Amino acid sequence: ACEWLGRYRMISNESLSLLKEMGGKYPEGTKVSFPGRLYNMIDNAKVEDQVKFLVLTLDHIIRLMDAREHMNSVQWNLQTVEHFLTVLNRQSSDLKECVARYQPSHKESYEKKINRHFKILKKNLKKKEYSAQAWEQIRRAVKHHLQRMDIIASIANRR
């Protein structure tokens, strides 16, 4: 089995504590559209698809948040942003070892759905010229992603 699914929750708890610690309470108007129905579907998916979904989603969060030259407007402590991303990169690398044992797939509707969501988050971030509000919207969405990802990992680990 994928040995890292047992370790995923402790490292997830660390990632969420870093996301909280790096900055303060949200500015006004941080609620944005979130793919709850997609996560309910993945909760019910095969382990293989759960783990592939976790890797796709981790890499998307990393690629959305690792352009630090676009973070001049945030009050976040960038040392803690860098620590956060280092932890997610560890999660992704470790789960990719599990994905390597699967037959590769690129036509799953979950991959298209999560790509579209992350394209929307990036578009709205650029439209708001990387404002503190725009980044806090992404911070709130990412917190929710990571909470639902920990539940997926737990469901995969207990099969």
Numbering used by the authors: 2 to 160
What does the paper say about this structure?
Teleost type I interferons (IFNs) are categorized into group I and II subgroups that bind to distinct receptors to activate antiviral responses. Based on the patterns of cysteines involved in the formation of disulfide bonds, teleost fish type I IFNs can be classified into two subgroups, one containing two cysteine residues (group I) and one containing four cysteine residues (group II), and can be further divided into seven phylogenetic groups, namely, IFNa–f and IFNh. However, despite a high sequence diversity, all type I IFNs share a similar structure consisting of 6 alpha helices (A–F) that are arranged in unique up-up-down-down topology. Functional studies have shown that CRFB1 pairs with CRFB5 to form a receptor complex that interacts with group I IFNs, while the CRFB2/CRFB5 form a heterodimeric receptor that is activated by group II type I IFNs.
The crystal structure of CiIFNa was determined at 1.58 Å resolution with space group C121 by molecular replacement. As expected, the structure reveals a typical type I ifn architecture of 6 structural elements, denoted A through F. The helices A, C, D, and F form an anti-parallel four-helix bundle, which are arranged in an up-up-down-down orientation. The helix F is straight, which is the hallmark of type I ifn. One disulfide bond formed by Cys3-Cys99 is present in the CiIFNa, linking the N terminal region with helix D, and is analogous to the disulfides found in other vertebrates’ type I ifn. The structure of CiIFNa was compared with that of known type I and III members including human ifn-α2, ifn-β, ifn-w, and ifn-λ and zebrafish IFNφ1 and IFNφ2 by superimposition analysis. It is apparent that CiIFNa has the most structure similarity with zebrafish IFNφ1 (fish group I type I) with an root mean square deviation (RMSD) value of 0.879. Notably, no helix element is present in the AB loop of CiIFNa. The Arg35hIFNw or Arg33hIFNα2 in the AB loop contributes greatly to the interaction with IFNAR2 and is substituted by glycine in the CiIFNa. In the present study, we showed that CiIFNa (group I) interacts with not only CRFB1 and CRFB5 but also CRFB2, indicating that it engages with all three receptors for signaling. Furthermore, mutation of Leu27, Glu103, Lys117, and His165 markedly decreased the phosphorylation of signal transducer and activator of transcription (STAT) 1a induced by CiIFNa in the Epithelioma papulosum cyprini (EPC) cells, and Glu103 was shown to be required for the CiIFNa-activated antiviral activity.
